[PDB]
Amino acid sequence: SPWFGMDIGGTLVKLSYFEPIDITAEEEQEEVESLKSIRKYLTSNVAYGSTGIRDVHLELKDLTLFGRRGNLHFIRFPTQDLPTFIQMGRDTVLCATGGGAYKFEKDFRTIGNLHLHKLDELDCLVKGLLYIDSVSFNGQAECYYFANASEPERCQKMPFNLDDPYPLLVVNIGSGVSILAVHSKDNYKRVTGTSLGGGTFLGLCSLLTGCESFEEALEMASKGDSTQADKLVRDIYGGDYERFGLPGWAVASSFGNMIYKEKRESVSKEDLARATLVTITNNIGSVARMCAVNEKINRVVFVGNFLRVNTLSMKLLAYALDYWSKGQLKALFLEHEGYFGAVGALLGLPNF
Amino acid sequence: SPWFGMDIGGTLVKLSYFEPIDITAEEEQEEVESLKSIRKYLTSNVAYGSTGIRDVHLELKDLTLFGRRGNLHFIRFPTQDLPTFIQMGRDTVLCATGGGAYKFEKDFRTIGNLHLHKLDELDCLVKGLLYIDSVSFNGQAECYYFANASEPERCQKMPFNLDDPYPLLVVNIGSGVSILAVHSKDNYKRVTGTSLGGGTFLGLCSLLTGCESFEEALEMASKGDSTQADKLVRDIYGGDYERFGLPGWAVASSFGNMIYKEKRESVSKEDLARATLVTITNNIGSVARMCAVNEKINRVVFVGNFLRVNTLSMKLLAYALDYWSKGQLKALFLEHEGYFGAVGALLGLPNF
Numbered sequence: 065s066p067w068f069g070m071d072i073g074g075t076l077v078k079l080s081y082f083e084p085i086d087i088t089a090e091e092e093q094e095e096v097e098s099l100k101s102i103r104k105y106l107t108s109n110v111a112y113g114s115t116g117i118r119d120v121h122l123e124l125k126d127l128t129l130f131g132r133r134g135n136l137h138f139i140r141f142p143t144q145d146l147p148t149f150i151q152m153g154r155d156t157v158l159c160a161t162g163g164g165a166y167k168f169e170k171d172f173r174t175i176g177n178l179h180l181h182k183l184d185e186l187d188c189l190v191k192g193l194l195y196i197d198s199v200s201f202n203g204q205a206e207c208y209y210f211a212n213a214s215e216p217e218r219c220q221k222m223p224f225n226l227d228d229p230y231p232l233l234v235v236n237i238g239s240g241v242s243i244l245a246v247h248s249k250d251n252y253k254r255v256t257g258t259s260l261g262g263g264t265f266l267g268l269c270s271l272l273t274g275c276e277s278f279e280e281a282l283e284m285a286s287k288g289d290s291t292q293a294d295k296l297v298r299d300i301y302g303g304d305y306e307r308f309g310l311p312g313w314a315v316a317s318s319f320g321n322m323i324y325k326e327k328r329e330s331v332s333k334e335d336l337a338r339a340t341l342v343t344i345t346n347n348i349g350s351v352a353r354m355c356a357v358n359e360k361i362n363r364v365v366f367v368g369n370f371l372r373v374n375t376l377s378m379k380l381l382a383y384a385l386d387y388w389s390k391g392q393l394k395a396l397f398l399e400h401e402g403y404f405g406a407v408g409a410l411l412g413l414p415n416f
Numbered sequence: 417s418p419w420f421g422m423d424i425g426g427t428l429v430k431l432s433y434f435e436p437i438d439i440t441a442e443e444e445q446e447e448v449e450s451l452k453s454i455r456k457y458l459t460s461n462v463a464y465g466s467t468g469i470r471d472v473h474l475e476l477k478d479l480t481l482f483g484r485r486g487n488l489h490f491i492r493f494p495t496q497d498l499p500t501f502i503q504m505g506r507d508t509v510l511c512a513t514g515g516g517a518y519k520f521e522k523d524f525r526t527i528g529n530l531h532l533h534k535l536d537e538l539d540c541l542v543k544g545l546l547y548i549d550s551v552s553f554n555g556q557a558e559c560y561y562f563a564n565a566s567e568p569e570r571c572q573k574m575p576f577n578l579d580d581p582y583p584l585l586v587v588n589i590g591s592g593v594s595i596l597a598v599h600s601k602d603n604y605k606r607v608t609g610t611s612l613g614g615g616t617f618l619g620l621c622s623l624l625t626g627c628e629s630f631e632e633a634l635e636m637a638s639k640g641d642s643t644q645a646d647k648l649v650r651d652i653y654g655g656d657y658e659r660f661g662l663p664g665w666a667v668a669s670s671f672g673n674m675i676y677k678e679k680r681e682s683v684s685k686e687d688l689a690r691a692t693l694v695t696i697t698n699n700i701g702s703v704a705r706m707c708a709v710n711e712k713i714n715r716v717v718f719v720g721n722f723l724r725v726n727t728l729s730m731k732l733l734a735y736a737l738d739y740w741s742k743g744q745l746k747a748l749f750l751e752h753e754g755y756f757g758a759v760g761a762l763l764g765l766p767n768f
């Protein structure tokens with residue numbers, strides 16, 4: 065059978081697929097036609113149907129896995145389209161995680177003789193994260209940070225070594241947010257979570273602006289001015305609130321200037337998109353900061369697809385975590401940030 | 417001069433006014449006409465102009481303050497209308513707090529010979545809170561909780577003794593949120609804050625529903641179903657997420673079902689109002705929970721006018737804090753919740 069791992073989230077399905085590249089002449093003969101059709105389909109296309117995408121830039125080349133050499137591919141599509149995926153499959157051992165491994169268990173079993181093995185979504189996340197960092201991103205660092213995140217003329221992506229990664233606070237920004245404390249390879253806990261996550265950004269942005277995609281929401285946000293919607297400290301105090309070290313530019317009330325009808329009539333969709341992004345991102349960083357202080361962990365890594373093609377939120381997190389922590393916490397990011405659960409599921413294959 | 421304290425917030429001005437009731441015959445003679453006009457105006461009206469309100473039910477009767485007996489009155493109006501207030505004043509020592517004490521300092525000084533004394537908004541909050549609890553609410557408890565907050569057929573308001581109130585976590589829900597740790601009458605700190613406060617509720621609700629007042633937003637929310645907009649754990653898992661004790665009814669992603677166009681087309685304004693209220697209230701409780709755990713404080717008191725005439729948010733806080741704390745934290749509420757800064761400012765009068 066082909067080697068897959070799948071993470072079925074509330075919004076996106078993530079699939080990790082190992083393509084063997086050491087197939088012998090005899091193995092190619094014994095390779096059944098349906099299986100050759102799937103490998104050729106997956107490796108000769110980068111778009112699958114109307115909504116599946118292979119993230120070619122993330123491919124790990126010439127990886128040794130389970131004693132074979134191959135390429136590790138990263139594929140995503142909306143969970144809304146999982147029925148199409150299963151129907152094509154109906155036209156094999158599947159290790160699957162995320163809530164959808166449970167929700168759609170009966171649907172996967174419509175594939176005759178398919179063996180579904182449900183694995184825990186945060187177990188798989190930790191295992192996949194640690195594995196990908198260990199093997200490297202084709203010899204480059206998997207983990208990075210933004211150096212000098214408070215100075216835009218200096219701020220730049222730089223590699224970060226995770227060779228001894230414990231302890232680590234992992235902030236998984238999906239539909240919602242889960243916060244994990246990782247103390248060892250076998251000692252981790254879910255500290256808490258928040259409901260204000262990527263689904264809040266996308267849902268509120270769609271309601272407020274009429275955008276029809278994540279990418280459109282980000283493009284709108286890139287053009288907006290969140291201070292047209294937000295009430296700042298200087299709007300209330302006339303300046304800094306010196307006594308408690310609050311700068312005048314800090315947001316006192318997200319969307320707080322929208323209590324005034326005339327301001328609601330002048331605000332642009334782009335302003336609202338940017339205010340939504342800033343509101344969600346600052347809340348995530350603040351919750352991460354509080355959890356890091358309580359867990360006594362100073363390295364905070366952010367994962368999940370809220371941050372894919374989202375440099376604005378990444379740089380806001382990098383700046384805000386450093387600023388509000390007075391430099392005590394460091395924001396870390398990973399190149400394969402949305403796919404760790406799917407990789408961790410694939411890594412469960414030998415147990416079955 | 418009349419005895420006032422004023423808290424000029426980002427949204428509302430709160431005024432505490434001490435009406436002497438022990439005026440002698442000789443004092444009444446020496447009482448200048450403008451001053452009698454103000455006392456009669458304040459005590460014979462409950463609405464002032466088009467936007468000022470006296471909260472008559474909060475009046476403290478026959479209070480002894482600064483060696484005189486009198487009634488303590490509680491009055492509020494929008495900060496947007498402070499120019500009207502100052503203009504009428506132009507037609508005396510003012511102790512003032514909130515950001516507006518700084519922002520509008522020059523405007524108060526247009527009142528000839530007026531002495532403005534700016535006092536810190538969180539100093540005044542702590543002093544006013546401790547004072548009002550100490551004198552009682554006309555012999556009744558100032559502080560209350562919701563007994564059996566998880567069982568609607570049992571849940572009921574009950575008095576709570578704060579005779580030894582330390583330590584205490586104070587959550588001030590105004591335009592934004594400030595979280596205070598109070599260790600003694602002279603030892604308190606601002607732990608942190610969040611930008612997702614009462615102004616976020618009102619501003620987002622106005623954008624999403626077209627409501628034109630706080631009270632209208634609450635009325636809409638009372639009729640709505642937040643689960644039409646929110647994505648729940650059971651929407652992702654099909655049920656509970658047993659491994660981490662997350663019930664299926666918990667919100668996984670606030671507004672997360674609004675990423676689907678057909679759901680945006682079916683959701684009602686009332687549903688959106690309720691989702692906004694639930695989103696903001698749960699975030700406040702969660703941040704309060706994390707701060708209480710870090711500060712090692714088990715009593716959490718919620719103040720500010722986000723909760724005025726807002727039993728929905730109060731009961732949600734009471735239930736959520738108890739539930740997610742596994743009964744380790746208690747949500748507390750105060751009858752005079754919006755006015756403590758104004759009282760604390762009034763209490764600064766003897767220092768000048």
Ligand SMILES: Nc1ncnc2c1ncn2[C@@H]1O[C@H](COP(=O)(O)OP(=O)(O)NP(=O)(O)O)[C@@H](O)[C@H]1O
Nearest residue numbers: 073074075076237238239240262263278368369370
């Ligand atoms: N193409 C896309 N379509 C939808 N959302 C996207 C897309 N790209 C990025 N996003 C964002 O990524 C979020 C989903 O991230 P992801 O980590 O895949 O969550 P999930 O696993 O599907 N949800 P969960 O069940 O809570 O773990 C969305 O809420 C968006 O903010």
Ligand SMILES: Nc1ncnc2c1ncn2[C@@H]1O[C@H](COP(=O)(O)OP(=O)(O)NP(=O)(O)O)[C@@H](O)[C@H]1O
Nearest residue numbers: 425426427428589590591592614615630720721722
């Ligand atoms: N009549 C009202 N008008 C406006 N907002 C109201 C009203 N009644 C209750 N509210 C709510 O109360 C909040 C303001 O509470 P309040 O404690 O008075 O804040 P503030 O002091 O004006 N702001 P801040 O400068 O941040 O401390 C608003 O954001 C609303 O959610």
Ligand SMILES: C[C@H](c1ccc(CC(=O)N2CCN(c3ccc(C#N)nn3)CC2)cc1)C(F)(F)F
Nearest residue numbers: 300316346349350384385388592593609610611
């Ligand atoms: C005094 C009062 C008020 C001011 C400010 C705030 C908001 C606030 O205190 N903060 C601090 C924490 N902050 C973040 C952000 C990102 C990260 C990370 N990563 N961490 N913390 C958010 C804003 C509330 C009330 C008002 F009168 F001026 F309105």
Ligand SMILES: C[C@H](c1ccc(CC(=O)N2CCN(c3ccc(C#N)nn3)CC2)cc1)C(F)(F)F
Nearest residue numbers: 240241257258259652668698701702736737740
């Ligand atoms: C697993 C993942 C997910 C589930 C749930 C959540 C949200 C979450 O974890 N919580 C816990 C803390 N919680 C509150 C609320 C109020 C108070 C008080 N007072 N305290 N805590 C908010 C919700 C995120 C992600 C998903 F796959 F199912 F999506």
Ligand SMILES: [Mg+2]
Nearest residue numbers: 073074162238
């Ligand atoms: Mg996920």
Ligand SMILES: [Mg+2]
Nearest residue numbers: 425426514590
């Ligand atoms: Mg205030």
